Amino acid sequence: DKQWERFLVPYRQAVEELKVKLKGIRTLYEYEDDHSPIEFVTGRVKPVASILEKARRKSIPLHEIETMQDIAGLRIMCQFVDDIQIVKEMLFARKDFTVVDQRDYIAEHKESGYRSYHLVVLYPLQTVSGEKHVLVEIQIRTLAMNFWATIEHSLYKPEKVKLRLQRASEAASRLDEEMSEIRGVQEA
Amino acid sequence: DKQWERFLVPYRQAVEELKVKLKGIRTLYEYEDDHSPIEFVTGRVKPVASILEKARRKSIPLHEIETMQDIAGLRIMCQFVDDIQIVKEMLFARKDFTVVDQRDYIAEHKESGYRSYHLVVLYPLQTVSGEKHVLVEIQIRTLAMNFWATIEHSLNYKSGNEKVKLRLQRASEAASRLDEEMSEIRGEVAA
Amino acid sequence: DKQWERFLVPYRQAVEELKVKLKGIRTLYEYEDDHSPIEFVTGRVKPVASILEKARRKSIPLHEIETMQDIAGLRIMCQFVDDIQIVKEMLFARKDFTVVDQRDYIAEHKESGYRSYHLVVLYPLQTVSGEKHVLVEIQIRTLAMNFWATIEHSLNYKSGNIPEKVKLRLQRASEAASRLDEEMSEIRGEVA
Amino acid sequence: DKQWERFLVPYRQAVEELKVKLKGIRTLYEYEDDHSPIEFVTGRVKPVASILEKARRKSIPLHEIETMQDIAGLRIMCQFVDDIQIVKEMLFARKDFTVVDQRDYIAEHKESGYRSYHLVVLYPLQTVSGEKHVLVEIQIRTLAMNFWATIEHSLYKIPEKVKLRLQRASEAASRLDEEMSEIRGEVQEA
Ligand SMILES: Nc1nc2c(ncn2C2OC(COP(=O)(O)OP(=O)(O)OP(=O)(O)O)C(OP(=O)(O)OP(=O)(O)O)C2O)c(=O)[nH]1
Ligand SMILES: Nc1nc2c(ncn2[C@@H]2OC(COP(=O)(O)OP(=O)(O)OP(=O)(O)O)C(OP(=O)(O)OP(=O)(O)O)C2O)c(=O)[nH]1
Ligand SMILES: Nc1nc2c(ncn2[C@@H]2OC(COP(=O)(O)OP(=O)(O)OP(=O)(O)O)C(OP(=O)(O)OP(=O)(O)O)[C@H]2O)c(=O)[nH]1
Ligand SMILES: Nc1nc2c(ncn2[C@@H]2OC(COP(=O)(O)OP(=O)(O)OP(=O)(O)O)C(OP(=O)(O)OP(=O)(O)O)[C@H]2O)c(=O)[nH]1
Ligand SMILES: Nc1nc2c(ncn2[C@@H]2OC(COP(=O)(O)OP(=O)(O)OP(=O)(O)O)[C@H](OP(=O)(O)OP(=O)(O)O)[C@H]2O)c(=O)[nH]1
Ligand SMILES: Nc1nc2c(ncn2[C@H]2OC(COP(=O)(O)OP(=O)(O)OP(=O)(O)O)[C@@H](OP(=O)(O)OP(=O)(O)O)C2O)c(=O)[nH]1
């Protein structure tokens, strides 16, 4: 299976560079103190097994899984739902990649209960031969959404429970709105 | 402060080592692939400013701030409260260090609402002199408690000044219930 | 002095980024599994101390310290001198920055015998406040040159000033070193 | 297959941990106001291919490869040959592992020209199952040795005249090392 691992080399690289780039955004507020809209950033390559599986599901020819948009992904975590908008601004203003696609599951959460902002970028990768472009999916979401989705994604490992899970999601969504509301201590 | 810097180097070394060690557990659960009892591992050394400040408001003579327990600290993050217990039992079993204090604020949350399991270890550090020991506070919490704690902590960090506080209190309670509901949903899927 | 670390934020950032970008070049050879022209890659942000010194020397006003070429630097270590050309061409082809200066102290060694290939680049750091370009110096060396340069530098960190019997020579050291590389290149040549 | 991926997990972990432990040693000198005996530190685990070919060469029966001493290896580089003694002491004085073997190829340098000090330690990895011990081979060398060792290791790709030029290249490096420390001595007298 060296075949695919050789294929994923530029995806690994793309992710590592984007980790350093985005993890450093936060670092900019670190010497003006303030409040940073970014709490932390994670990154990952879809494991080969998952890549072939999803390509069948959405019926993609092995010759064109490049068009699969989340072989490489990064995840940005914020405190408040209004930070997501701010982070959006940045990623759009950036010109070391270019935004290609977007899916707002914060406005219209999924039937599962799932909430996140997904923006797919086109990352220009420098290689020994020339210049490749790989699709990276960045996912922006609050800690609350991240709490919900991390547990739900795991359960991967019954209809009564799909419902309780959807209930839990919105419970969590209210706890979001409540902290943002609480943030009205700005009255100082 | 070049003097301070020499004081904090062992603590930084201690965070870095434990960081790598504890991500060993996560790393290991990726193979034998069930859900890892550790989601994230972070670590920080207290900034000199906060070291002096925490010192002031607890007496602690500036020649005895080695007794301050959280100069070095790691935070461990778990999906489930069940996962915390596993992580707790792993730490007590380790030979690379020694537990010397624990404060269970999951059982009895603080007045502010804060929940977390706090474990204090004595970490041995090889040096150029001989062998140094340092106190490192390991904090364990769920994604849900981590959500509350991060947000409440930041708000407090702007000075800290009423009815807001009681809403924060209830907020912790909501999160606890979300935690409980997810545990129930878990054993429900056993079936 | 808290002004300095805020000043240096974009410098470490840029260094961190080129570090990951360059190590990736190496990585593109553990799969190809042939010879990689890059063995190691390091980076530094000049200490405030060194920055201040270098400012007076080069005659750089402190409010335009930005014009200093190596506040941020990276260093790439190669096996053979020929590897240095392969990396030079690679760097010149990259479009995530642009080359603005080069100094070939390999062909024309410095007085004290220091050898290396320096190229200075203009790096496009994205930030919240828009963009920003930083001058980053990339040094390129063989292991052999690296050996000499490291040691000489550590010595030159004794009062700066230094005897002329230790000055009987490290150039001779450096010429010896230069000949080792010469030899190693030749030896390699024997492939048959 | 995956029975290997599982085998190497304690080795990759022990490497990651020692990497952090040893890199930290130089950091003790960033405010020591002295010179650090460690310049840098590298780490690797042996890729399965390499592991197999070695055991099917040194004639090691598979079912006990965990006797093979360098499945996990770190490597310490120094400026001077005097540093190597110093680091060596530290390593011996450490309590987070025990030294169990040693090969001084600086003292007695191998037909090829190979010079470096090899230290073998038993590392007590805390695992979930308990406490595993794993053999890790630490290699200490000067930059000079490293320049030579690195190039020669890669020439993996033979003429008896070439083997000899290489031998003399090792010597050349060794002298240049000695000249360096010599130069270093004269510097101290000032
Ligand atoms: N502030 C904050 N950070 C969190 C939190 N949870 C996780 N992190 C961090 O997540 C990081 C990176 O994501 P991780 O998924 O845990 O994976 P990593 O093992 O760090 O691999 P990666 O670095 O991304 O290749 C961090 O540090 P770095 O990678 O930057 O360095 P450091 O790792 O030294 O802490 C974090 O501090 C959190 O609740 N709050
Ligand atoms: N070891 C060694 N290095 C040398 C020698 N000559 C020049 N260099 C270095 O070159 C560096 C970077 O490029 P420049 O100094 O700008 O190149 P030059 O234009 O030739 O120097 P110049 O501007 O004329 O003084 C160094 O880093 P810095 O010292 O500035 O910062 P650090 O110690 O952090 O590495 C050097 O130490 C030498 O004889 N021996
Ligand atoms: N967000 C939040 N965090 C809390 C709360 N209560 C305690 N913690 C934390 O507990 C810490 C460790 O304290 P412990 O010594 O384990 O227990 P305590 O006795 O309750 O603290 P104490 O000794 O009284 O100060 C922290 O680090 P430090 O603040 O000291 O340093 P940092 O800013 O790095 O987080 C906390 O922020 C709380 O009500 N909300
Ligand atoms: N460049 C170079 N390196 C040498 C030479 N001789 C030995 N070494 C190395 O020594 C290694 C480990 O040391 P030991 O096994 O303890 O010493 P020995 O008993 O002499 O080797 P042996 O057991 O006979 O094979 C290596 O790793 P491995 O090769 O096994 O794998 P890799 O380089 O990928 O790590 C070496 O390459 C040499 O003549 N030139
Ligand atoms: N926890 C959770 N995550 C969800 C849910 N719905 C979608 N996501 C995720 O969305 C992913 C990628 O986003 P998109 O492809 O842009 O959005 P969609 O088109 O809706 O996905 P889709 O085509 O339906 O699969 C994920 O990574 P992958 O699963 O593909 O791989 P991994 O989790 O390992 O990263 C998700 O897990 C959900 O209901 N719960
Ligand atoms: N301080 C110093 N470092 C040197 C010198 N020559 C080479 N190095 C190296 O410095 C490295 C980095 O040191 P680190 O402490 O690991 O810091 P980093 O730059 O962030 O690397 P890191 O990624 O953390 O390992 C190397 O990475 P690796 O490829 O080994 O691992 P690696 O691939 O891991 O880089 C080196 O080979 C020198 O004269 N002085």
Domain of A71, CATH number, reads 3.30.460.10
Q: 3-state class of A102 per DSSP?
A: strand
CB spacing of B186 vs A146 below 8 angstroms: no
Rounded to 10 deg, the angle between the D143-154 and D160-188 helix axes is 170
Do both A157 and A139 map to the same domain? no
Relative to the CA of C152, which ligand 2 atom is closest? 1
Measure the CA–CA gap between A76 and A43, rounded to whole angstroms. 9
CA torsion D44→D45→D51→D54, rounded to 10°? 40
Return the residue of D nearest to B28 by Cα.
D9
Do both D171 and D103 map to the same domain? no
Distance from the first to the final alpha carbon of chain C: 61
Measure the CA–CA gap between C136 and D119, rounded to whole angstroms. 39
Look up residue D58 and give its two tokens: 């040194």
Do both B159 and B73 map to the same domain? no
SS (H, E, C) chain D: CHHHHHHCHHHHHHHHHHHHHHHHHHHCCCCCCCCCCCCEEEEEECCHHHHHHHHCCCCCCHHHHHHCCCCEEEEEEECCHHHHHHHHHHHHHCCCCEEEEEEECCCCCCCCCCCCEEEEEEEEEECCCCEEEEEEEEEEEEHHHHHHHHHHHHCCCCCHHHHHHHHHHHHHHHHHHHHHHHHHHHHHCC
- Method of determination is X-ray
Q: Pick from C144, C181, C136: which is nearest to C12 by CA?
A: C136
Sheet holding B117-126, edge to edge: B40-45, B72-78, B131-142, B117-126, B98-104
The alpha carbon of D114 is separated from its chain's Cα centroid by a whole number of angstroms, namely 12
Return the residue of C nearest to D79 by Cα.
C151
Burial of C59 from C-beta contacts in 10 A (0-12 / 13-18 / 19+): exposed
Do both B11 and B41 map to the same domain? yes
Q: Cβ contacts (< 8 Å) between A13 and chain C: which residues?
A: 24, 27
Q: Cβ contacts (< 8 Å) between B159 and chain A: which residues?
A: 188
Measure the CA–CA gap between C20 and A29, rounded to whole angstroms. 22
Do both B13 and B39 map to the same domain? yes
Measure the CA–CA gap between D42 and D188, rounded to whole angstroms. 30
Measure the CA–CA gap between D46 and D49, rounded to whole angstroms. 8
Pairing of strands A72-78, A131-142: parallel
Do both D138 and D152 map to the same domain? no
Instruction: Establish how many alpha carbons lie within 13 A of residue B137's alpha carbon, considering only the half-sphere containing its beta carbon.
Output: 18
Within the 78-97 window of chain C, which residues sit less than 8 Å (CB to CB) from chain D?
79-80
CB spacing of A90 vs C128 below 8 angstroms: yes
Rounded to 10 deg, the angle between the B143-157 and A159-182 helix axes is 10
The alpha carbon of B20 is separated from its chain's Cα centroid by a whole number of angstroms, namely 15
Do both D85 and D3 map to the same domain? yes
Residue D40 domain boundaries:
1-145
Pairing of strands B98-104, B117-126: antiparallel
Centroid of ligand 1 to alpha carbon of A120 (angstroms): 22
CB spacing of A28 vs C127 below 8 angstroms: yes
Do both D99 and D185 map to the same domain? no
Resolution in A: 2.9
User: Which residue of B36, B41, B42, B151 sits with most ligand 1 atoms within 8 Å of its CB, as the best mutation to test the pocket?
Assistant: B42
For chain A, say whether B155 makes contact (Cβ under 8 Å).
Answer: yes
Centroid of ligand 3 to alpha carbon of B149 (angstroms): 10
D190 is known to lie in a ligand binding site: no
DSSP character at residue A98: E
Centroid of ligand 1 to alpha carbon of A23 (angstroms): 9
Do both C156 and C77 map to the same domain? no
- Other CB atoms within 10 Å distance of the CB of residue C157: 9
Is B137 assigned a catalytic role?
A: yes
Residue D98 identity: T
Residue D48 identity: V
Buried b / exposed e along D94-124 (16+ C-beta atoms within 10 A): bebbeeeeebebbeebeeebbbbbbbbbebb
Centroid of ligand 6 to alpha carbon of D40 (angstroms): 6
Query: Phi first, then psi: what are they for C24, rounded to 5°?
Result: -65, -30
CB spacing of A21 vs C96 below 8 angstroms: no
Query: Phi first, then psi: what are they for D68, rounded to 5°?
Result: -65, 125
Q: How close C173 gets to chain D, by Cα (Å)?
A: 7
Query: Which of C9, C17, C95 comes nearest A20 by C-beta?
Result: C17
Ligand nearest to the CA of A20: 1
Per DSSP, what are the bridge partners of residue C121? C99, C136
Per DSSP, what are the bridge partners of residue D131? D126
Mutate to test the interface with D, among B4, B15, B41, B126 (most CBs of D within 10 A): B126
Do both A67 and A107 map to the same domain? yes
Burial of A103 from C-beta contacts in 10 A (0-12 / 13-18 / 19+): middle
**DSSP-H helix ranges across C34-167:** 48-57, 81-93, 143-155
- The torsion region of residue C2 among left (phi > 0), alpha (psi -120 to 50) and beta comes to alpha
Do both B67 and B107 map to the same domain? yes
Rounded to 10 deg, the angle between the B143-157 and B164-188 helix axes is 170
Domains: count for chain B: 2
C17 is known to lie in a ligand binding site: no
Buried b / exposed e along A44-64 (16+ C-beta atoms within 10 A): ebbeeeebeeebeeeebeeee
∠ CA(A163), CA(A164), CA(A168), 5° rounding? 120
For chain A, say whether B5 makes contact (Cβ under 8 Å).
Answer: no
Query: Phi first, then psi: what are they for B104, rounded to 5°?
Result: -90, 95
Neighbours of chain D (3+ CB pairs under 8 A): B, C
Do both D185 and D93 map to the same domain? no
